[PDB]
Amino acid sequence: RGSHMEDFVRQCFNPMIVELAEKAMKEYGEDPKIETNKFAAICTHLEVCFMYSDGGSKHRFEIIEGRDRIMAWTVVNSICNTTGVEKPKFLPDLYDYKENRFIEIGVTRREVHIYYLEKANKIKSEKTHIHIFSFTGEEMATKADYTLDEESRARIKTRLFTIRQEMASRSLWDSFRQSE
Amino acid sequence: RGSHMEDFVRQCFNPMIVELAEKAMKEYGEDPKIETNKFAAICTHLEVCFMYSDGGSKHRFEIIEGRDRIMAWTVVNSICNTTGVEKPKFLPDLYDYKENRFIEIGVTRREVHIYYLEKANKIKSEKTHIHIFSFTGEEMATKADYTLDEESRARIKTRLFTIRQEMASRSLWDSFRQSE
Amino acid sequence: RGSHMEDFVRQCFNPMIVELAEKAMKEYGEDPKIETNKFAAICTHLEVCFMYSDGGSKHRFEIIEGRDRIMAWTVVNSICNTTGVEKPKFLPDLYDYKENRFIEIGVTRREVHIYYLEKANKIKSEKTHIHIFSFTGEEMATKADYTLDEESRARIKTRLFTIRQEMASRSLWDSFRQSE
Amino acid sequence: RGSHMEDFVRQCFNPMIVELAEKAMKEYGEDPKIETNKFAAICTHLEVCFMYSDGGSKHRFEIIEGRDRIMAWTVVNSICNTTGVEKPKFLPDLYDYKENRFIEIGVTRREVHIYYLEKANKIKSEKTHIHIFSFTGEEMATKADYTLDEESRARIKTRLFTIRQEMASRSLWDSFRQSE
Numbered sequence: 001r002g003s004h005m006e007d008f009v010r011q012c013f014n015p016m017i018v019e020l021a022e023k024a025m026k027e028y029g030e031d032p033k034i035e036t037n038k039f040a041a042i043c044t045h046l047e048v049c050f051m052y053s054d055g056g057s058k059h060r061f062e063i064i065e066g067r068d069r070i071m072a073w074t075v076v077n078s079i080c081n082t083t084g085v086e087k088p089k090f091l092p093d094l095y096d097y098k099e100n101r102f103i104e105i106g107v108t109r110r111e112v113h114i115y116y117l118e119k120a121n122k123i124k125s126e127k128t129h130i131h132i133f134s135f136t137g138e139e140m141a142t143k144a145d146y147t148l149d150e151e152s153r154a155r156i157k158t159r160l161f162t163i164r165q166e167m168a169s170r171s172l173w174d175s176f177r178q179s180e
Numbered sequence: 181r182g183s184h185m186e187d188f189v190r191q192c193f194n195p196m197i198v199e200l201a202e203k204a205m206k207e208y209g210e211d212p213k214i215e216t217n218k219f220a221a222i223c224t225h226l227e228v229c230f231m232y233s234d235g236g237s238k239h240r241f242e243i244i245e246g247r248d249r250i251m252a253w254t255v256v257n258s259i260c261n262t263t264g265v266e267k268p269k270f271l272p273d274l275y276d277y278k279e280n281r282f283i284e285i286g287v288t289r290r291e292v293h294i295y296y297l298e299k300a301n302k303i304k305s306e307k308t309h310i311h312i313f314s315f316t317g318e319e320m321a322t323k324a325d326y327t328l329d330e331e332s333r334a335r336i337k338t339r340l341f342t343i344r345q346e347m348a349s350r351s352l353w354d355s356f357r358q359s360e
Numbered sequence: 361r362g363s364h365m366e367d368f369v370r371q372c373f374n375p376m377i378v379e380l381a382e383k384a385m386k387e388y389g390e391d392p393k394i395e396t397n398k399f400a401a402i403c404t405h406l407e408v409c410f411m412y413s414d415g416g417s418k419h420r421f422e423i424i425e426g427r428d429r430i431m432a433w434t435v436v437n438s439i440c441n442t443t444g445v446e447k448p449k450f451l452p453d454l455y456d457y458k459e460n461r462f463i464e465i466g467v468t469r470r471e472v473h474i475y476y477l478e479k480a481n482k483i484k485s486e487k488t489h490i491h492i493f494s495f496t497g498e499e500m501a502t503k504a505d506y507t508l509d510e511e512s513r514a515r516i517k518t519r520l521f522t523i524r525q526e527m528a529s530r531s532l533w534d535s536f537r538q539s540e
Numbered sequence: 541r542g543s544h545m546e547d548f549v550r551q552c553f554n555p556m557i558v559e560l561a562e563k564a565m566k567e568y569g570e571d572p573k574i575e576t577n578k579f580a581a582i583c584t585h586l587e588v589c590f591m592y593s594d595g596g597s598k599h600r601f602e603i604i605e606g607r608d609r610i611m612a613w614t615v616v617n618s619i620c621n622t623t624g625v626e627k628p629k630f631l632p633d634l635y636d637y638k639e640n641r642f643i644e645i646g647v648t649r650r651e652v653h654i655y656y657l658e659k660a661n662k663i664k665s666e667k668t669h670i671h672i673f674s675f676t677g678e679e680m681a682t683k684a685d686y687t688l689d690e691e692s693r694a695r696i697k698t699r700l701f702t703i704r705q706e707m708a709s710r711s712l713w714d715s716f717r718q719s720e
């Protein structure tokens with residue numbers, strides 16, 4: 001295939017993220033050289049999840065995303081049987097040891113409301129906290145409890161807008177936005 | 181011998197822990213290839229002690245476990261003659277510079293009460309603080325003063341339950357539980 | 361050319377700073393072997409900017425100086441469109457996520473008042489915060505809000521006076537002061 | 541010469557400390573293979589100074605000891621001309637940016653009172669703060685303002701008593717104590 005978007009992803013995101021995203025796609029029968037926009041979205045979602053877990057204190061967050069499915073669910077079981085929290089029907093992205101709730105992190109190229117709705121009706125599980133970021137700088141969170149302080153969220157939003165500009169400078173943005 | 185439990189231990193715990201546990205067993209005339217459940221228990225107890233000492237601040241805890249016997253007692257003497265605390269009759273696991281007391285950490289596959297009792301009657305030394313963790317997520321501590329905040333304890337309990345699941349996924353758990 | 365000041369700069373500042381300063385000069389058609397005092401000033405300004413951003417918390421400051429022009433402006437756009445702050449007419453040195461303002465850092469061998477005035481009339485942009493340091497230990501900041509606590513500023517001033525003494529011990533100071 | 545005390549020093553203290561102590565002795569025309577007790581005392585004083593500066597916050601302390609004489613005085617000049625503090629007649633060990641005073645750290649095998657007196661009458665300079673530690677666990681400080689919190693001081697005292705026991709276990713202590 002040899003797309004521009006594939007080479008941009010490997011040059012824009014750090015190698016641990018790119019490697020984790022490649023594994024994730026191949027685990028579900030997808031190819032980063034063909035599904036290159038999905039490749040870019042998964043790297044972005046990964047980097048946001050990691051920046052998020054760095055926003056708290058040392059021990060605050062348990063990272064669920066970026067693990068293989070079986071180990072991710074194993075950590076979820078341990079957390080649930082240790083804290084008595086309901087076992088979510090779907091894999092969340094993090095666990096907040098301070099607020100004692102699982103977090104599902106969303107990154108969308110749409111209006112946060114339109115994504116939150118879809119991400120909440122399908123969420124079904126009432127317990128898990130939801131937190132959406134947008135490539136335009138909007139964010140929406142359950143009960144408007146945004147977990148982290150403003151500074152850590154602001155850095156996530158700045159990084160997201162930088163990724164947008166880099167894609168636009170290479171004319172890859174419009175194809176990326178129109179392929180959600 | 182070549183047991184499954186031995187290979188699981190080396191693949192589940194990090195090499196510094198495995199090495200420290202091997203030394204500890206050989207110092208007391210035990211073989212990790214034969215006493216493989218004891219091998220697993222010592223690695224677990226070691227990892228819990230290290231996670232515990234990381235839960236406090238930078239200078240809070242002095243680590244006693246994981247040293248050879250003579251150096252461990254040497255540090256105890258220095259702590260005692262520096263803080264005036266009673267020299268314990270038995271080797272503790274940590275010293276809390278903030279609360280000024282030695283800590284004995286227990287990890288059991290039984291009810292925390294049954295282990296605490298045995299670990300307290302044999303403790304004899306009235307001064308040292310006791311803190312028990314279980315593979316099911318229960319904890320018991322002297323005066324119910326659990327030293328660390330909830331988040332740091334919760335991580336220890338999550339790790340303990342992950343070790344349990346990994347053993348069970350390999351059918352090693354029932355032999356591990358029935359060999360205390 | 362082979363000047364003493366060039367060899368002093370490479371021996372006094374750390375290699376990442378020296379390399380960043382060399383790139384910056386060559387990007388604007390200047391040579392560090394000829395414009396050696398400018399070479400020294402840019403390394404100094406760079407080290408001060410980096411020490412400054414280290415004075416805050418983990419996530420407080422976004423570093424703008426030390427990047428190439430296009431990426432520096434890209435980060436500025438992301439910050440502006442994320443926080444709604446006015447896009448400055450000129451490239452600032454940092455962004456404070458806590459106080460939500462861009463910072464322009466000045467390092468002068470003159471009176472802070474004389475430099476602040478020139479650095480403020482040409483600043484034009486009313487929004488960006490200004491913070492001047494001197495090689496004698498004086499500092500001046502917008503509204504006399506010096507952003508960081510005293511200890512972090514004191515370290516910057518101590519380093520600046522050490523650079524002065526080292527230049528004077530090599531008789532390079534008077535040429536450095538008289539070439540602003 | 542090949543003394544036991546020399547081999548104990550190299551095996552007990554870390555290589556950066558041993559190297560810094562060797563330079564310090566040779567700068568003043570002393571040999572670590574002959575003045576082996578002085579060798580041990582300088583390594584001890586160095587390790588205490590470094591542990592002390594680690595007890596505060598990130599930016600709190602400027603380290604003066606362990607530098608060559610000319611650079612140590614250069615940092616002192618910068619600190620003095622930056623904070624307006626009196627230039628001490630003698631080289632101190634640290635500068636506290638939080639309390640804005642130089643610290644002279646003492647490590648003695650005598651009574652802290654007997655050492656403090658001698659270390660204060662010869663200090664002459666009224667401004668610099670004095671802080672003495674003993675190999676028995678006593679400490680004395682100017683105005684009984686001990687700068688650091690109890691935990692950080694307790695660790696210094698524990699290390700000092702460990703060095704004592706190690707020397708005694710090798711029958712080197714009595715020669716060390718009787719050679720102040």
Ligand SMILES: COc1cc2c(cc1OC)CC(NC(=O)c1nc([C@@H]3CCCN3C(=O)CSc3ccccc3Cl)[nH]c(=O)c1O)C2
Nearest residue numbers: 024025028030038042045065090091092093104105106107
């Ligand atoms: C391929 O089918 C599935 C895969 C997975 C799950 C469920 C799946 O369906 C049965 C759970 C887990 N999904 C997430 O972790 C997750 N998913 C999303 C969005 C909306 C929901 C589906 N989705 C995808 O992207 C699916 S594709 C994909 C996802 C992750 C890695 C690689 C690929 Cl290829 N958004 C997130 O913010 C988020 O964290 C992995």
Ligand SMILES: COc1cc2c(cc1OC)CC(NC(=O)c1nc([C@@H]3CCCN3C(=O)CSc3ccccc3Cl)[nH]c(=O)c1O)C2
Nearest residue numbers: 204205208210218222225245270271272273284285286287
């Ligand atoms: C082999 O005899 C002894 C060995 C040791 C001590 C005393 C011993 O008896 C004379 C002190 C010290 N023990 C502990 O540090 C410690 N011990 C335990 C449990 C209950 C009490 C005995 N025990 C064991 O596991 C003994 S075997 C063993 C222990 C540690 C490493 C390697 C091996 Cl092989 N539980 C802990 O939580 C704990 O910290 C080492």
Ligand SMILES: COc1cc2c(cc1OC)CC(NC(=O)c1nc([C@@H]3CCCN3C(=O)CSc3ccccc3Cl)[nH]c(=O)c1O)C2
Nearest residue numbers: 384385388390398402405425450451452453464465466467
């Ligand atoms: C070469 O022209 C220009 C270059 C640049 C800018 C603007 C320029 O004019 C069109 C923006 C940016 N300047 C700064 O970031 C900056 N500049 C200064 C001082 C007063 C204003 C001009 N200046 C210089 O030093 C110019 S030369 C120079 C500067 C930086 C690196 C290398 C060189 Cl060679 N003082 C700072 O504290 C400070 O942060 C780069």
Ligand SMILES: COc1cc2c(cc1OC)CC(NC(=O)c1nc([C@@H]3CCCN3C(=O)CSc3ccccc3Cl)[nH]c(=O)c1O)C2
Nearest residue numbers: 564565568570578582585605630631632633644645646647
């Ligand atoms: C060799 O002459 C001198 C050397 C030096 C100074 C002054 C000297 O006299 C002219 C300043 C500086 N001294 C200290 O920094 C310092 N000195 C001491 C004790 C009591 C005062 C003298 N002293 C020594 O140990 C001297 S020998 C020595 C010292 C340090 C390294 C190597 C050697 Cl060989 N105690 C400390 O706690 C302390 O910090 C270096």
Ligand SMILES: [Mn+2]
Nearest residue numbers: 065091092093
């Ligand atoms: Mn996910």
Ligand SMILES: [Mn+2]
Nearest residue numbers: 093104105106
């Ligand atoms: Mn997600």
Ligand SMILES: [Mn+2]
Nearest residue numbers: 245271272273
């Ligand atoms: Mn123990």
Ligand SMILES: [Mn+2]
Nearest residue numbers: 273284285286
């Ligand atoms: Mn124990």
Ligand SMILES: [Mn+2]
Nearest residue numbers: 425451452453
């Ligand atoms: Mn600049």
Ligand SMILES: [Mn+2]
Nearest residue numbers: 453464465466
């Ligand atoms: Mn500047």
Ligand SMILES: [Mn+2]
Nearest residue numbers: 605631632633
């Ligand atoms: Mn000294």
Ligand SMILES: [Mn+2]
Nearest residue numbers: 633644645646
């Ligand atoms: Mn001293």
